[PDB]
């Protein structure tokens, strides 16, 4: 599947930036290299933390027009219940923003127990970069939307 | 119950495709063989993963008109909390799309601990294929909708 | 409390039918025998499983007019997480249908660990039939709605 | 803070009535004795169980006009998962009714493991009556609403 | 990032006030000292408990106009399930108020097991004050909103 006429939005948080970057990259590289998406047609905005992902996307979805958007962030279990509650709220939030807007929202949220699990899913230490999967998903959902 | 005039939509994800296929088949075979549904009246679309099920169905529900739709996907517990969160969000999502649209949405989502449990519910290794149940359910809900 | 002019709707699923029936009966008998509800004023529709309860009620709530509705079904814990997710989604769903419509929705959903717990709450093996409680509740909420 | 011109609504369920009463009392006494609320300006309606709280409040909120409302009920853990699901649904429901209506809704819901824990929070056996806290909260939220 | 023209709202509950204060301070100090926010442009309202946070913010968001708002409160695990349910409901509530209003809502909610964990996250006993992070987040989201 190729989508030269597709406009894609990518919002990512900045916590655990060491895992975020590889993910964003994989997502971008895959879209371009494999689906023929134009670099100029890929906006990349960012927010403080995962909590802000739904809100950031909603805002951007209103300003311009995209065919698909990818929310990227990584939450790591800490000492309190904070992890559980943010996670649940953010995931429900992204789903809402997508269903309300009609714009496909790809889940690029990692909810892990430790940094290692994150890096592994970001393609480091022998793992498969999930940002790639997200990229292809964005493209597919974008086309089917039209 | 027979529904020759029924138009059914089936959206399924592609992860764990080995379990997905038997499910879709059972759903289709049952509708046809037991409820007299016309093969031409059964659309079968697909999306990347379960996360996209609600969004894919919403989109399709807007394009054409169906009497019932079946969402099919299988989520398997991994090393992180990802499974728990996607599961909860997807299930709430499908329920929403159905209640908002007024179109019956049948739950063909398997949330299992391991691949074996999935295959078993797909009719392999001595189990009962649940896609069959979903097929009959789609038909029943479709008629009662009219 | 008596409600001769009340119109009640009862939607029940068909899984674990052995527990369902006693429940529906108790609900009906109580409404009639104790609150003076007219048998002709009690509609009893049914759906495949608990998942369809919210959707079935929404549909019916649109076709006719009722003063109260009772959703009845029984979910039993199995080997997977399916039970947990359907349960949470269905309960949220019923609450939504009630709050959106303005029509009182009585919860006649049993979420048990095993069939015995269900039958017990259906009045068998020395237990108290909960359908009775639901019946009176339907009547009370119906009147206060007016 | 005093609110002589405030109209307060109090809906309470009737299960575990032994814990409910002390709670309602404390709420009323505190509002009057400490915030100068007029007894005639305090409506007290009731419903069967906690499940009906959101629905009862919605109904009443539509009939008349209140500055604040207090939902009171006590759920006790039993042998099944029923407790967990009603609890989650009711709490989400009350929050919704408040946010949709714009009318402050005070949470007077006790979700305990056993009757003792309930009575203790109702001021018996050496505990502090939480209904008092709820009363003051109702008054504060009511004024700030204006 | 600096936001001299930004109007920020801060609503905080009053339970566990010993942890609340340091948080509010850090939030204010950081906004001023590091982002050039004008003290006159920072409203600080308060409510009884965390349950009231969403409702308080909704009310204020309607009265005036803000570029960003910060909800602050701390919930501590007790003997009952109350903690879990308030937590889940409040977090979903804040997310809703933000998505409905279009106004960025920063999560300054601590859901801890004990007072120590709270104080630690408020900057005492060797910990980092999270109110600072929230302050910067408020500023960033506010600007991007424009
Ligand atoms: C602890 C903690 N952890 C994370 C995290 O792990 N990932 C994340 O992406 N974010 C984390 N955050 C922050 C949260 O997303 C948000 O930016 C603030 O609460 C203000 O609204 C955390 O506070
Ligand atoms: C791990 C993992 N597992 C699954 C799965 O098990 N089933 C599934 O059906 N999907 C899984 N996914 C993907 C998820 O549905 C979605 O396609 C992406 O997150 C992008 O939005 C997974 O990432
Ligand atoms: C296993 C299983 N169990 C139940 C159950 O226990 N009770 C129930 O009431 N239903 C169960 N169902 C079915 C579910 O309610 C629904 O009919 C289908 O998923 C199609 O949408 C089950 O699949
Ligand atoms: C068991 C059980 N327990 C309670 C309870 O503990 N508290 C409660 O306040 N209610 C309980 N209920 C009833 C529930 O609130 C509702 O009235 C009915 O389900 C019909 O809609 C229970 O069924
Ligand atoms: C126990 C308990 N704990 C808290 C708490 O820890 N933090 C909090 O911030 N609040 C707590 N509350 C109160 C709750 O937020 C609310 O003010 C009332 O229920 C009335 O609606 C508690 O009742």
Measured in residues, chain A has a length of 146
Least CB–CB distance from A113: residue in B55, B80, B96: B80
Among D91, D104, D113, select the one facing E89 at the smallest CB separation. Answer: D91
CA distance D94 to A128: 44
Chain B contact set for C51 (CB, 8 A): 106-107
* CB E68, CB E104: distance < 8 Å: yes
CATH of the domain at D132: 3.40.50.960
Q: Which residues of D are catalytic?
A: 82
Q: Could you give the number of structural domains in chain E? A: 1
- Tally the C-alpha atoms within 13 A of residue B110's C-alpha that lie toward its C-beta: 31
Contact in structure between C97 and C66 (CB atoms under 8 Å): no
**What single string gives the DSSP state of each residue in C50-110?**
GGGHHHHHHHHHHHS--SEEEEEEEEE--SSSHHHHHHHHHHHHHHHHHHHH---EEEEEE
As a whole number of angstroms, the distance between CA E60 and CA E40 comes to: 16
Technique used to solve these coordinates: X-ray
Which residue in E12, E35, E82, E128 is the catalytic one? E82
User: How far is Cα of residue E105 from the mean position of the Cα atoms in its chain?
Assistant: 8
Residue A55's alpha-carbon distances to A79, C120, E101, E103, E145, in angstroms, are: 26, 48, 10, 8, 9
Contact yes or no for A81 and E140 at CB 8 A: no
Phi, psi of B127 (to 5 degrees): -90, 170
C-alpha of C83 from chain center: 18
B48 in contact with ligand 2, CB cutoff 6 A: yes
Calpha distance C64→E116 (Å, rounded): 57
Resolution (A): 2.8
Chains that touch A (3 or more CB pairs under 8 A): B, E
Residue D80: CB atoms within 10 Å: 19
Cα–Cα dist C101/C112, whole Å: 28
- Separation between Cα atoms, residue A14 and residue A48, nearest integer Å: 5
* Burial profile C83-106: b = 16 or more Cβ within 10 angstroms, e = fewer: bbbbbbbbbbbbbbbbbeeebbbb
DSSP symbol at E122: B
Phi, psi dihedrals of residue C114, rounded to the nearest 5°: -155, 160
Contact B72, B20 (CB under 8 A): yes
Would you call C35 a catalytic residue per the annotation? no
- Those residues with Cβ within 8 angstroms of residue B33's Cβ, 6 or more apart along the chain or in another chain: none
DSSP type of residue C128: P
Residues of B classed as catalytic: 82
Q: What is the rounded CA–CA span in Å between residue E129 and residue E106?
A: 15
| Probe site for chain C from D11, D48, D64, D96 (most C CB atoms < 10 A) | D48
Inter-chain contact D85–C95, Cβ cutoff 8 Å?
A: no
> Per DSSP, what are the bridge partners of residue C12?
C46, C72
Phi, psi angles (nearest 5°) of residue B44: -130, 100
Residue C37: domain span: 1-146
Sign for the pseudo-dihedral over CA of D83, D89, D92, D93: negative
Indicate the residue of B92, B133, B145 with minimum beta-carbon distance to C59.
B145
Chain centroid, CA C126 distance in Å: 22
Task: Measure B92 CA to nearest chain C CA, in Å.
Answer: 6
User: Helix, strand, or coil here: E69?
Assistant: strand
Residue B124 tokens, joined: 């392999």
């Amino acid at each position: 599947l190729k989508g030269p006429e597709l406009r894609i939005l990518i919002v990512h948080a900045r916590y655990n930036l060491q895992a975020i970057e590889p993910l964003v990259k994989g997502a971008v590289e895959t879209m371009i290299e494999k689906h023929d998406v134009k670099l100029e047609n890929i906006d990349i905005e960012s927010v403080p933390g995962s909590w802000e992902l739904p809100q950031g996307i909603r805002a951007s979805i209103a300003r311009n027009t995209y065919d698909a958007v990818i929310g990227i962030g990584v939450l790591i279990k800490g000492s309190t219940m904070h992890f559980e509650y943010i996670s649940e709220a953010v995931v429900h939030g992204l789903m809402r923003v997508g269903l309300d807007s009609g714009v496909p929202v790809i889940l690029g949220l990692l909810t892990v127990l430790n940094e290692e699990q994150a890096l592994y899913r970001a393609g480091l230490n022998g793992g498969h970069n999930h940002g790639n999967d997200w990229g292809s998903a964005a493209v597919e959902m974008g086309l089917k939307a039209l």
